[PDB]
From a paper:
During the crystallization efforts that led to the monomeric apo- and peptide-bound Nck1-SH3.1 crystal structures, seven more structures were determined that all exhibited domain swaps, leading to dimers. The swaps are located at the exact same position in all structures (i.e. Lys-36 in the n-Src loop), clearly visible based on the high-resolution electron density. Dimers are formed by exchange of the C-terminal 25 residues, almost half of the entire SH3 domain. The interface thus generated contains a short anti-parallel β-sheet encompassing the CD3ϵ sequence 36KSWW39. Superposition of the Nck1-SH3.1 structure with the bound CD3ϵ peptide shows that domain swap and tight peptide binding are mutually exclusive. The C-terminal half of the SH3.1-binding sequence would get into steric conflict with the second SH3.1 domain in the dimer. All of the dimers are swapped in the same manner, but with different juxtapositions of the second SH3.1 domain with respect to the first. The hinge at Lys-36 provides quite a bit of flexibility that allows the dimer to pack in many different crystal lattices. Indeed, the hinge region varies over ∼6 Å within the superposed ensemble, and the distal loop covers a distance of ∼8 Å in the dimers. Given the large number of swapped, independent chains present in different crystal forms and grown under different conditions, swapping seems an intrinsic property of this SH3 domain.
Residue numbers in the entry:
A (entry chain A): 3 to 56
B (entry chain B): 0 to 57
Write the structure that this text describes.
């Protein structure tokens, strides 16, 4: 699935991707949602949203 | 402030440095809550995460 950047996104962490408006992007996992989480040793990263519950 | 404690349903093995290894039943803090991210690749074959509202299927 090719998608298109609607707007500029300036990465606010080294863990995010910078994209330019109109940029052609390849959407990689059947458009699955990821969430950003932090563990008890203060490490942060993305996990697929379906792997956690409140 | 907007950080809720969530529990891992399953083990997850990180496939990129920006992802996080987690264990089933591990307690984690969910950040930027409401914020759904998509894993994308650009024309320079860099893969990374962007907020879902910044992209669309045309």
């Amino acid at each position: 699935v090719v998608v298109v950047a609607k707007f500029d996104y300036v990465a606010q962490q080294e863990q995010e991707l910078d994209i330019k408006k109109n940029e052609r992007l390849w959407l990689l996992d059947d458009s699955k949602s990821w969430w950003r989480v932090r563990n008890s040793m203060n490490k942060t990263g993305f996990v697929p949203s379906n792997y956690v519950e409140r």
